[PDB]
């Protein structure tokens, strides 16, 4: 069985580590106690934060902490470090399998709240929804830019996420 | 007009409002040929339980300030009496004494 | 025109009514121009306008309405020197104890609190637990904890038991210290003893006890909480001859408090798990 | 009910309006509850601040009001003290970002409304009208207005029959468009009940 | 070298150093125990607040310089406020009384 | 093309308005199309004056809106962007509209 544990790099080179980590392993061939390397990512949390799937031997951990630009594991103490958890793994799956039932083409557009308009001529604007309708895909939305924001002639064209 | 009919209009207005959706929905319902007939009939059934008041022609325009029913404006929400002061005052823009 | 200077402790209240707005960003300036950032270190609305009697963005460029601030500009409407004596504040996320009465040689917390400093600087530095108020349990209220003392505590007394760590619980012993009722325990101790080396370590425990008492300082303004700026005039960001700005230390300072502020925000919004904002909250206490 | 509003006739000509926004249908009486809501609130406020004229008048989903006050000081308070408090709490009956401008009034003497409240006050401490009366005609012209003419009306002294008097000086002409006629109003609450008051002060021509 | 009114520096209102940036002497610190150990005390007094440091003092002692009148009017150095805002920006909390 | 649609009550302010649009557009810009005046609308209202009662006592107001109709041929990086900054006199509701 395997356990996680987090290590600290130099953040800002962290994919390098990653990979130099991942050599490391197939260079000792201590294949059979290491099992992932984790760095998530969002469209980048953790910052600076590498995760490993890890068994605690004294020799894999200074192979860990042979790689290059690592600084140690984070945990209670430096004799025996601290894995993390497991019943906040459970919360954690779910929110990550809803990372993509979503957050794209929501059926139709998304028009009538807040947006930012940004496309040809009327680029880099905003402006609330008022005025679109669905049958037409047409947008009239206001182009708020010196107060009088009248909703100019437009469409699903410019509409961003602003 | 007395404190009390203006709180009776305010409180027409909210239920005007809170109930808006679900009776829009009921006439739909009742108004579609395409419906069963048992369907309809809860549907308008359905309509008289909510309350009257959540009708919107159940409330009157009064005027904004004053409360006045009659001779109520919707371009200004004021009774003409409280229209013309506003307008000689000057607080209406645009609005002055016209003449052709 | 006055008499006497009088020094005292900073309350967070009093920290906040020095202020004048909360520094959030640690960006100093735009750096590519002359604009400094909104809302960031150099701000605007925060302290006030660079030009006198201007505003930095666009308005205002007489001498009718000095005051005026409009949305398109964030900015305040006086003097060249108005923020020279205007300062900022930095909510810390987490708290952070202040080393000026930690490490004083004798520390300020060290002899107040009656514990050792090596025992205070590891709890401090998140490697070390303390008790506060446990309850029905066999243990005291200044004896700490282990990773060890405590994973076993915590399948023990899972109820009633409070053992927190960082300045967070240095903060509630502090706050929850009654000072009057210590000083009759001491003058009672010093009464009831003969020990030499003791008399002179309880004279001393009892003298700091009594003064604070007489004063206006409460024990928990030992601990920092809204950090206080120092005005940018009085850390000036000047151009040596070149195009490049020759930065103070003041703003490496500064800019590195409020980058590790903000990500400890960030974290304690993502729910993080426990090391990681111990990490954090420790780099935020080193910094 | 014979005279027409000397103010209101000439809108279209030398007096501005007060209230100076564009709206369609849709946002119009919205404005105008709006409006008055807020010069309500002014009103009640800066009743001991010698308020003639709230200016309303909102670009952009954006209130920007202008107080025309004889002794902006008591607006002001401390800087930016009194006029801040005003700012947000407008926001709140405007519902929008307010803006508050303090035109200062030269001349209070010369200002119709302003007169006119004096008048008012004077009568609400129980002076004697008529005595009231002159020192407005008076100050007026000492201050160099054209002409002015004030009028009261009601249980003057509290008398049990009502009658109107009014003192004119100068020339008022009303029937003359382009005369510039500053007119307004007041009411004194008196024990004996309300008086009103009412005051021109014509001061000049305008030629375009 | 010499000066009568030249360049003053940023942070601290107090002239600039050196020939080339055209600075003024320092009146340093045992200078100023020799100044303490005569009875002079308005030499010392405008010697460090009118000057050095207070712009308002100074400018003021502009103004009676060159209209005849031999008098300054003190106010506070600029640099012991700068003393209060370093002070201060710590957790401790610094004033005046009274 | 930019279609740009100026409303306001008092025509002078318009007209104001207009001009120094048309300078915006043409110091940056070129092929300023123009400034064409579209028909007023004279919303008239009617009301009665008496607080009682008087059928024939009544005054009539109205709201004269007054339309300009301005166009920009070409619309280059110079001259869209100029607008940004360059706001107009209040209580002139424009509205730009390119295509
Ligand atoms: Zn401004």
Redesign the interface.
């Given at each position: 069985k395997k356990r996680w544990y987090v290590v600290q790099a130099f953040s800002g080179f962290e994919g390098r580590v990653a990979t130099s980590l991942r050599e490391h392993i197939k260079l000792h061939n201590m294949e059979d106690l290491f099992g992932e390397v984790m760095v998530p990512t969002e469209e980048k949390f953790f910052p600076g934060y590498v995760l490993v799937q890890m068994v605690m031997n004294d020799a894999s951990w200074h192979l860990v902490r042979s790689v290059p630009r690592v600084m140690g594991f984070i945990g209670g103490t430096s004799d025996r470090p601290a894995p993390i958890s497991d019943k906040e793994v459970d919360a954690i799956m779910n929110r990550l399998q809803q990372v993509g039932d979503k957050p794209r083409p929501k059926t139709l557009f998304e028009p009538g709240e807040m947006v930012r308009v940004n496309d040809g001529p009327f680029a880099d604007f905003n402006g609330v929804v008022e005025e679109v309708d669905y049958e037409k895909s047409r947008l009239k939305v206001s182009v708020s830019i010196f107060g009088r924001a009248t909703p100019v002639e437009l469409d699903f064209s410019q509409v961003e996420k602003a | 007009a007395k404190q009390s009919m203006k709180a009776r209009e305010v409180k027409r207005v909210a239920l005007a409002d809170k109930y808006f959706a679900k009776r829009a929905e009921l006439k739909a319902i009742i108004s579609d040929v395409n419906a069963s007939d048992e369907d309809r009939w809860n549907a308008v059934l359905k309509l008289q339980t909510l309350p009257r008041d959540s009708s919107p022609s159940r409330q009157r325009n009064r005027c904004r300030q004053t409360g006045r029913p009659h001779g109520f404006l919707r371009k200004f929400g004021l009774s003409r009496i409280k229209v013309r002061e506003a307008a000689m005052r000057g607080e209406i823009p645009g609005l002055k004494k016209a003449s052709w | 025109e006055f008499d006497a200077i009088k020094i005292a402790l900073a309350s967070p209240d009093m920290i906040r009514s020095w202020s004048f707005g909360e520094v959030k960003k640690p960006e100093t300036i735009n750096y590519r121009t002359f604009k400094p950032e909104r809302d960031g270190l150099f701000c605007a609305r925060i302290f006030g306008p660079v030009k006198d009697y201007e505003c930095l963005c666009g308005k205002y460029k007489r001498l009718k309405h000095r005051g005026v601030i409009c949305e398109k500009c964030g900015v305040e409407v006086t003097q060249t020197k108005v923020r020279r004596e205007r300062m900022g504040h930095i909510e810390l996320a987490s708290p952070t104890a202040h080393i000026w009465f930690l490490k004083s040689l004798p520390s300020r917390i060290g002899l107040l609190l009656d514990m050792p400093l090596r025992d205070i600087e590891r709890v401090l530095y998140f490697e070390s637990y303390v008790v506060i108020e446990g309850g029905m349990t066999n243990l005291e209220r200044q004896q700490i904890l282990t990773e060890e003392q405590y994973l076993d505590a915590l399948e023990e007394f899972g109820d009633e038991f409070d053992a927190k760590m960082g300045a967070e619980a240095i903060q509630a012993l502090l706050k929850s210290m009654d000072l009057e009722q210590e000083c009759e325990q001491l003058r009672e101790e010093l009464n009831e003893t003969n020990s030499e080396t003791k008399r002179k370590k309880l004279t001393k425990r009892i003298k700091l006890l009594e003064a604070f008492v007489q004063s206006g300082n409460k024990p928990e303004w030992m601990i920092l909480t809204v950090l206080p700026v120092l005005p940018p005039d009085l850390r000036p960001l000047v151009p040596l001859d070149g195009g490049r700005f020759a930065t103070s230390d003041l703003n490496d300072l500064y800019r590195r408090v409020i980058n590790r502020n903000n990500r400890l925000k960030r974290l304690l919004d993502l729910a993080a798990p426990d090391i990681i904002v111990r990490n954090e909250k420790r780099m935020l206490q080193e910094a | 009910g014979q005279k027409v509003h000397p103010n209101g006739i000439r809108l279209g000509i030398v007096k501005p309006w007060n209230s100076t926004w564009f709206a369609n249908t849709k946002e119009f009486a919205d404005n105008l509850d709006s409006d008055f809501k807020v010069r309500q609130y002014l009103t009640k406020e800066l009743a001991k601040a010698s308020v003639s004229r709230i200016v309303i008048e909102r670009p952009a989903k954006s209130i920007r009001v202008t107080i025309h006050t004889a002794r902006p000081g008591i607006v002001i308070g401390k800087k930016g003290e009194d006029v801040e408090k005003l700012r947000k709490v407008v926001a709140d009956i405007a519902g929008v970002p307010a803006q508050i401008n303090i035109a200062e009034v030269r001349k209070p003497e010369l200002d119709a409304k302003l007169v006119a409240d004096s008048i008012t006050s004077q009568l609400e401490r129980r002076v004697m009208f008529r005595r009231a009366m002159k020192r407005a005609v008076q100050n007026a012209m000492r201050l160099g207005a054209k002409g002015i003419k004030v009028e009261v009306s009601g249980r003057l002294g509290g008398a049990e029959i009502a009658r109107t008097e009014w003192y004119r000086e100068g020339r008022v002409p009303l029937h003359t468009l382009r005369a510039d006629i500053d007119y307004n109003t007041s009411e004194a609450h008196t024990t004996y009940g309300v008086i009103g008051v009412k005051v021109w002060i014509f001061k000049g021509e305008i030629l375009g | 070298h010499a000066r009568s009114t030249g360049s003053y520096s940023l942070v601290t209102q107090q002239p600039l150093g050196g020939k080339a940036q055209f600075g003024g002497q320092r009146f340093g610190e045992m200078e100023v125990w020799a100044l303490e150990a005569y009875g002079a005390a308005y030499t010392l007094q405008e010697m460090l607040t009118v000057k050095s440091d207070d712009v308002n003092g100074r400018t003021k002692m502009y103004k009676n310089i060159v209209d005849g009148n031999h008098q300054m009017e003190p106010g506070m150095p600029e640099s012991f406020n700068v003393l209060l805002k370093e002070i201060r920006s710590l957790g401790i909390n610094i004033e005046l009384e009274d | 093309r930019?279609?740009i649609?100026l409303?306001?009550?008092?025509h002078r302010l318009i007209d104001q308005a207009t001009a120094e649009i048309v300078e915006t557009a043409k110091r940056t810009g070129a092929q300023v199309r123009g400034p064409i005046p579209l028909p007023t609308r004279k919303?008239?209202?009617t009301?009665?004056?008496?607080?009682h009662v008087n059928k024939d006592?009544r005054?009539?107001?109205?709201?004269?809106?007054h339309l300009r109709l301005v166009d920009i041929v070409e619309?280059t990086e110079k001259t869209?962007d100029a607008?940004?900054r360059?706001?107009?006199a209040?209580?002139?509701?424009?509205?730009?509209?390119?295509?």
């Open positions: - | - | - | - | - | 930019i279609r649609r409303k306001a009550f008092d919303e008239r209202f009301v009665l004056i008496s607080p006592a005054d009539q107001y109205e709201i004269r809106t619309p869209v607008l940004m360059l706001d107009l209040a209580g002139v509701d424009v509205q730009i509209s390119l295509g």
